[PDB]
UniProtKB/Swiss-Prot annotation:
Phosphorylation is enhanced during cell polarization induced by calcium. Phosphorylation may occur during the cell-cell contact-induced cell polarization and may contribute to the segregation of LLGL2 from the PRKCI/aPKC and PARD6B/Par-6 complex. The keyword Repeat applies. The gene is LLGL2. It is found in: Cytoplasm. This is LLGL scribble cell polarity complex component 2.
Length: 827
């Protein structure tokens, strides 16, 4: 009751399927819209807002009103929505105030009022809406009263033009609609066919116009408003002077920025001024159709320097952060924020070389496909500061610029403990995330692949997302990190097992290789496809961080399915689809292997090891406890091997010798998803070196131990060493649910329980050792098999699961580790 509680929290990572980018230069807050109707506001680390439109429709445009805590969104159904940041109870929240849909006359065409450009007037009193017909409608905010009196019709503009500039297309689409930077009375209107016009609002007269030789794509207005830069569908951009003395000019300077060959269109362009007199020219597209046409590029030109920033995904919006306010003399940019379809990129425009800016949030967790995730709770400070130190040297090429999107004040207090989330990926990388309280930022990246062996246009790949799968054999399957010693054990898809060690400096060392033939005592089989990797024979140099020292290749090179790493005994247990083996990573010697293949297996088998578990309990003698290894398979078989490890003073002088002690078969023959041994007080045996750092955690050896077996169908408790049954809990026979994952959870005095994730998406808690159902929740849905398979628990009642390939959703079952992210946006 007063210690169990499940509530939704926040989400981590890059939003799934974005479609709109917004940014308030005053508030310094980034806004992202998705194809599911969600808008996410991002400010300083800890300041985040999320909203949902009641209709499931993609967000196409986001316009944060100038100098106000409001924004206007446009969905693909031509709907407008006014959102605000109401401060309710010392902390601001996001809410949708009003809504409006542009209609048009009844008998009119539906696309005639399809909004193309939304112009928030500087007064924050009017919205100027460009449509596909060419008409610009005026909407007054709030109340959203479409003022039909102020409508600027298409032919109403053409009547002020000479006769030779009146050739109008049926749908003269408004592709440009901007306000004069120094005159709120003048607005610019841009049509597709090439007509650009400056309009006198209070007077209804055309003050300036020119026809474009090429189709109009976009335009940009200089700070003083005395020059226009238009980009066109032929891949060219030209400059136009704006002066009341010459209301009808010809272009000042035209060029196609990339080669004399045909080019793709330039969809957008910016003309930013600097105090040094060197303007920034930033345009998207314009790449040649000849070869570089299928590439998403954004080019920046400044002081004789050109760089075509190329992204691995579509560009669904970009902006440039400037030091200027609407009243400043010069723009002076310093950052280029690009919201790609799969990632977010920030480029430092001030530092010479234009280096990437490190992201404090919005990091694309799926830059490589996530294959596994492992959570380690409460990291000691000596290892914590060591990982953040080794992870700082690898981020040297990044900019020294502080995160520019610092808008807002996070009210969430500091995290209680240092939690750590690890993610294995398909390309062989492991990433260390700071899942302490809420914010999930990257600390260190590990690349395991190291064990296995033009000039124009100025293209330059940026971002970390790789949309290709070079080799799936590199995929990380199992991850184990000892927070006390720094030993890391990772397992791959091709049957590789790497045991790494964390040191502070670099090293050039050879990685010893040991073949673990799981089929040594059985012959008559031959592997078919997915052959093993190829390790470097020579001594490989490694950067500071987790350096590997031993490699164990399983034969056959099947996927590793279970992993256990005992740091004190210096043993690592690995298991594949056919068998398992115990390895002595201190002497780099194979202790034993056992082929578990049933005489008649499948074409998943029965001898498929699923769980590995080290323990120091009583197996044979009732009064002598010795190290042991436990292995559970799909056939309900539970193996137990008595281990004899030497003391630390002779660990390098005697081999570790094992001997099978028990073979237990559950009579319902359900797969074993968890083995666990309890001490005299029914407390689970502590992890390796957990007692070494807190000797009061020494397990009760006086008093009979208990064996806890968790299968896919039921829970059974035994009594060591005689392993006689004493308790049962047939969950599948009752609720009709099967156990997907189980984990010991310590809630808060504080006693231990069993956290169970069923295949239904529910999560139940079970007491120890009586196995009494304490509570039952509903985290994931039943149809969400993708997310329920990649769901991870923590020691203290917290969890993570994937709502999309890119986003983790966090949840907490404990009342003591609740976190409600509060933040404040002011002025
Ligand atoms: Cl702990």
């Amino acid at each position: 009751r007063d210690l169990f509680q499940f509530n939704k929290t926040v989400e981590h990572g890059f939003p799934h399927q974005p479609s709109a980018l917004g940014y308030s230069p005053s508030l310094r807050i980034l806004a992202i819209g998705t194809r599911s109707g969600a808008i996410k506001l991002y400010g300083a680390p800890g300041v985040e807002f999320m909203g949902l439109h009641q209709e499931n429709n993609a967000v196409t445009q986001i316009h944060l009103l100038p100098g106000q805590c409001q924004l206007v969104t446009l969905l693909d159904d031509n709907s407008l929505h006014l959102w605000s940041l109401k401060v309710k109870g010392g902390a601001s929240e996001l809410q949708e105030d009003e809504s409006f849909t542009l209609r048009g006359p009844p008998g009119a065409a539906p696309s005639a009022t399809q909004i193309t450009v939304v112009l928030p007037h500087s007064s924050c009193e009017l919205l100027y809406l460009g449509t596909e017909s060419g008409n610009v409608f005026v909407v007054q905010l709030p109340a959203f009263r479409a003022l039909e009196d102020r409508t600027i019709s298409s032919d109403a503009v053409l009547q002020r033009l000479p006769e030779e500039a009146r050739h109008r297309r049926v749908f003269e689409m408004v592709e440009a609609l901007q306000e004069h930077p120094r005159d709120p009375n003048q607005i610019l209107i841009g049509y597709s066919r090439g007509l650009v016009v400056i309009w006198d609002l209070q007077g209804s007269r055309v003050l300036y116009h020119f026809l474009s030789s090429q189709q109009l794509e976009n335009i940009w207005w200089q700070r003083d408003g005395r020059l226009l830069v238009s980009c066109h569908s032929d891949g060219s951009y030209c400059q136009w002077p704006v002066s009341s003395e010459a209301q009808q000019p010809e272009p000042l300077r035209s060029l196609v920025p990339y080669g004399p060959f045909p080019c793709k269109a330039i969809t957008r362009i910016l003309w930013l001024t600097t105090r040094q007199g060197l303007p920034f020219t930033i345009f998207q597209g314009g790449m040649p159709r000849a070869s570089y046409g299928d590439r998403h590029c954004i080019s920046v030109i400044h002081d004789g320097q050109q760089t075509a920033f190329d992204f691995t995904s579509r560009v669904i919006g970009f902006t440039v952060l400037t030091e200027a306010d609407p009243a400043a003399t010069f723009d002076d940019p310093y950052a280029l924020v690009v919201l790609a379809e799969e990632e977010l990129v920030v480029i430092d425009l001030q530092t010479a070389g234009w280096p990437p800016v490190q992201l404090p949030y919005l990091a694309s967790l799926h830059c490589s496909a996530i294959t596994c995730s492992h959570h380690v709770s409460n990291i000691p400070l000596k290892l914590w500061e060591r990982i953040i130190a080794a992870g700082s040297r690898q981020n040297a090429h990044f900019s020294t610029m502080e995160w520019p999107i610092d808008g807002g004040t996070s009210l969430t207090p500091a995290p209680p403990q240092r939690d750590l989330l690890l993610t294995g990926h398909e390309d062989g990388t492991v990433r260390f995330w700071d899942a302490s309280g809420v914010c999930l930022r990257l600390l260190y990246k590990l690349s395991t692949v190291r064990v296995f062996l033009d000039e124009w246009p100025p293209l330059r790949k940026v971002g970390s997302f790789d949309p290709y799968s070079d080799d799936p054999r590199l995929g990380i399957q199992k991850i184990f990190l000892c927070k006390y010693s720094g030993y890391l054990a990772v397992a791959g898809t091709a049957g590789q097992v790497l045991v790494l060690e964390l040191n502070d400096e670099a090293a050039e060392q050879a990685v010893e290789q040991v073949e673990a033939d799981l089929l040594q005592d059985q012959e008559g089989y031959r592997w078919k496809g997915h052959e093993r990797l190829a390790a470097r024979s020579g001594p490989v140099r490694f950067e500071p961080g987790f350096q590997p020292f031993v490699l164990v290749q399983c034969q056959p090179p099947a996927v590793v399915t279970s992993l256990a790493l005992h740091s004190e005994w210096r043993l690592v247990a690995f298991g594949t689809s056919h068998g398992f083996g115990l390895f002595d990573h201190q002497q780099r010697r194979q202790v034993f292997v056992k082929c578990t293949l049933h005489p008649s297996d499948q074409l998943s088998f029965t001898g498929f090891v699923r769980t590995l578990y080290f323990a120091d309990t009583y197996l044979k003698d009732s009064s002598r406890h010795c190290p042991s290894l436990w292995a559970g398979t799909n056939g309900g078989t539970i193996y137990a091997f008595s281990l004899r490890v030497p003391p630390a003073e002779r660990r390098m002088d005697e081999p570790v010798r094992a001997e099978q002690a028990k073979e237990i078969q559950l009579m319902h023959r359900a797969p074993v998803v968890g083995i666990l041994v309890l001490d005299g007080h029914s407390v689970p045996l502590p992890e390796p070196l957990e007692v070494a750092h807190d000797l009061s955690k020494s397990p009760d050896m006086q008093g009979s131990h208990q064996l806890l077996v968790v299968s896919e169908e039921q829970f059974k408790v035994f009594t060591l060493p005689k392993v006689s049954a004493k308790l049962k809990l047939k969950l599948t026979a009752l609720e009709g649910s099967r156990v997907r994952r189980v984990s010991v959870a310590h809630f808060g005095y504080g006693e231990h329980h069993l956290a169970v994730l069923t295949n239904l998406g529910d999560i139940q808690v079970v007491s120890l050792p009586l196995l009494k159902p304490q509570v039952r929740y509903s985290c994931i849905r039943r149809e969400d098999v993708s997310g329920i398979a990649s769901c991870v628990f923590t020691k203290y009642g917290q969890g993570f699961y994937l709502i999309s390939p890119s986003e983790f959703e966090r949840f907490s079952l404990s009342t003591k580790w609740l976190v409600e992210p509060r933040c404040l946006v002011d002025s």
